[PDB]
Paper text:
All MAGE family members contain a shared core MAGE homology domain (MHD) which is a ~ 200 amino acid long domain, which is well conserved across the entire MAGE family (individual human MHD’s share more than 40% sequence identity). The MHD domain structure consists of two highly modified winged helix WH domains WH1 and WH2 in a tandem arrangement linked by an extended β-hairpin. The biochemical basis for this activity appears to be exerted through binding to and modulating the activities of RING domain containing E3 ubiquitin ligases. Rather, each MAGE protein appears to recognize a unique region on its RING partner, suggesting that MAGE proteins are able to function as a versatile and adaptable protein interaction module.
Numbering used by the authors: -14 to -8, -4 to 0, 101 to 171, 174 to 191, 194 to 262, 269 to 312
The structure:
């Protein structure tokens, strides 16, 4: 029978491919969830396993966990369980706006961030203080962001016309508008900031710890 027995991979980094694979699956599940929010459809765990993480089912807690967190913080969407393994997706703080009219990425998350920034400067925040905080998270005046669009139009026009905000000549400054006061409160925005800052952070597992879920 005798043949050629001499000796993976050729050589490729399986460990770092793994954390990238998980991180891409966080991105992918997040976009999937946004679609489910747009469709006003419920979402089941089973659906998520079958349709998005068929090949990493046991990582569900971590991939779903981080995708949820991104929905909350970036998009202002809360992934609410029903209690089951079904979940509905609704805007944070009960806000009625998401900016889908852009029929893709909700802008609730950035509204919430601008409302919190004013809530923290007290009764009003200056134009400059709003641009600084938007800057720290990569949103700049006159620069069309992919997820949020052009922000000056967004702050100064859309959100003024929608009455979430007021923008006036005092330097310039922003204040909550009647809709913002109607739909939410300073107390609720600040408690939300507080709950987000205090959240249990999720670590990506190593290849070893992930093998230890079976």
């Amino acid at each position: 029978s005798g043949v050629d027995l001499g000796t993976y991979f050729q050589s490729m980094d399986a460990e770092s491919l793994f954390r990238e694979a998980l991180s891409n699956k966080v991105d992918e599940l997040a976009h999937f969830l946004l679609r489910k929010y747009r469709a006003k459809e419920l979402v089941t765990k089973a659906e998520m396993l079958e349709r998005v993480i068929k090949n990493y089912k046991r990582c569900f807690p971590v991939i779903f966990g981080k995708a949820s967190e991104s929905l909350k913080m970036i998009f202002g969407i809360d992934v609410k369980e029903v209690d089951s393994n079904t979940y509905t997706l609704v805007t944070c703080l009960g806000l009625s706006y998401d900016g889908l009219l852009n029929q893709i990425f909700p802008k609730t998350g950035l509204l919430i961030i601008v409302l919190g920034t004013i809530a923290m400067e007290g009764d009003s925040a200056s134009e400059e203080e709003i641009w600084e905080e938007l800057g720290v998270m990569g949103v700049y005046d006159g620069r069309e962001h992919t997820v949020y669009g052009e922000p000056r139009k967004l702050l100064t026009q859309d959100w003024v016309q929608e009455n979430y905000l007021e923008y006036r000549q005092v330097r310039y400054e922003f204040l909550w508008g009647p809709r913002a006061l109607a739909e939410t409160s300073y107390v609720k925005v600040l408690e939300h900031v507080v709950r987000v800052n205090a959240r249990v952070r999720i670590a990506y597992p190593s290849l070893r710890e992930a093998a230890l879920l079976e």
